[PDB]
Amino acid sequence: TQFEERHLKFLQQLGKGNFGSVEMCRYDPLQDNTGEVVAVKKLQHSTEEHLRDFEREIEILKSLQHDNIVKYKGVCYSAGRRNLKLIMEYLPYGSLRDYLQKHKERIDHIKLLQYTSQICKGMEYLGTKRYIHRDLATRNILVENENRVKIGDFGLTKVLPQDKEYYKVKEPGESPIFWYAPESLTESKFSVASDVWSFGVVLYELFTYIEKSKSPPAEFMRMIGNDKQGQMIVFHLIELLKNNGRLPRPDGCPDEIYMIMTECWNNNVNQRPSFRDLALRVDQIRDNMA
């Protein structure tokens, strides 16, 4: 937790997310080019609301210790408490979204299911802490090596109240609506079960291999008609999901995997599977394939 700004050497931008950025830096306190490369998240507009959210995000990440969750290393700030920065381990292959698109000819279904199982175990761990991730997507999953992925960003993550199994929240700005459960679109309710709905969309993403015209936004915009503007998009999306319109089975996806997706996409919040059942089903399919 003891990083001093004078010793962080900027190398390049790695990502520009909900509104902050992640940079590759070398932490080199001895100024001899032996320090380690780390990933550094900062806010791009340090309002007090975004800053309190960022402090809570930092506390959430520091409290998580799991093989499939990116490692907290520390914090760094300038004089006062301003320009707060989160220091994390650098993962060399980048986001799963980009990795999968780049290496799709070398990544088979058994490997996708290995990633799926690691994401499920990460999410189950979050749930044991009563955290709701709210932004599960392959762009927020990072690749440490070809056999290990990690949930890599927690900017929207909330803690459940102790008396309730959901958290109601609507932030100004724009929301990844094409990953959202219907009750998150209509009532702004987020829960473990809405994370399960999004997990279904992640599984869809993996099995499309991030083909550009097959993305959830592309498919949903086609299904509702590309005329829709602004708020009409969300309205028509809600109505589409209410009539059980769903993303199609991806090319080459086995029906057993598509059935996992469609069970995650249950309109009835209480009938969606748990992350532990998802991991068991995925691991049984993996074992059958091997």
Ligand SMILES: N#CCCn1cc(-c2nc(Nc3ccc(C4CCNCC4)cc3)nc3c2CCN3)cn1
């Ligand atoms: N999740 C999430 C969304 C926000 N976000 C977080 C990161 C991040 N990226 C990395 N590593 C990383 C990233 C990109 C590359 C590209 C570089 C050009 N050549 C191809 C590969 C390589 C390595 N390491 C991390 C983080 C967080 C903590 N550790 C990136 N975006």
